[PDB]
Design a protein around this ligand. Structure first.
Ligand code: VO4
Length: 175
């Protein structure tokens, strides 16, 4: 498939998956975390978090990870009750009661890194443990080198991006 379910209600996938409304409906997905530039035009059937970032060696994903993690938590909590967090960027639409697909163009780097950050925060995993958990469902995932580094910074600071950490401050200084 073009998307795979990592844990209950949380999917990672590619550009094909984001456009396949049949598969999204069949799996009860009503939220899309869309990590792509330019942003796509989605139907209002979905709540969408447009993350306008590239998959480049100088892309800053770290600054957005607390917002991404909090948005996924907002959705999955709401989905369970059906059966705002100050961390969430205001461009993220209010979560709807259903699953969430996190996607980029290929479903390997931006999207897998965002899902890994969520798994690190939710299950107290380190980046490798998180990424292995995803890879066992979607074997092609492979963060870029800079995303692996940024996941390490996110791990160190317990998911609050703090520049009291030397390495995090250094990352932002070099940018
Ligand atoms: O389109 V993604 O390259 O960040 O797998």
């Amino acid at each position: 498939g073009h998307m795979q379910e990592v844990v209950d209600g949380l999917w990672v996938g590619d550009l094909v998956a984001a456009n396949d409304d049949d598969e999204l409906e069949k799996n009860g997905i009503k939220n899309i975390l869309s990590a792509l530039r330019p942003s796509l035009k989605f139907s209002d059937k979905y709540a969408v978090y447009p993350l306008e970032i590239d998959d480049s060696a100088d892309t800053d994903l770290l600054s957005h990870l607390p917002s991404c993690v909090a948005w996924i938590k907002e959705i999955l909590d709401l989905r369970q009750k059906a059966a705002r967090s100050p961390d969430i960027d205001t461009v993220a639409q209010p979560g709807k009661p259903g699953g969430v697909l996190v996607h980029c163009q290929a479903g390997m780097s931006r999207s897998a890194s965002i899902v890994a950050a969520y798994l690190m925060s939710q299950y107290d995993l380190d980046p490798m443990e998180a990424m292995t958990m995803i890879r066992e469902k979607r074997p092609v995932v492979e963060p870029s080198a800079t995303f692996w580094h940024q996941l390490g910074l996110f791990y160190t600071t317990d998911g609050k991006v703090s520049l009291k950490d030397r390495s995090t401050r250094q990352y932002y200084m070099e940018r």
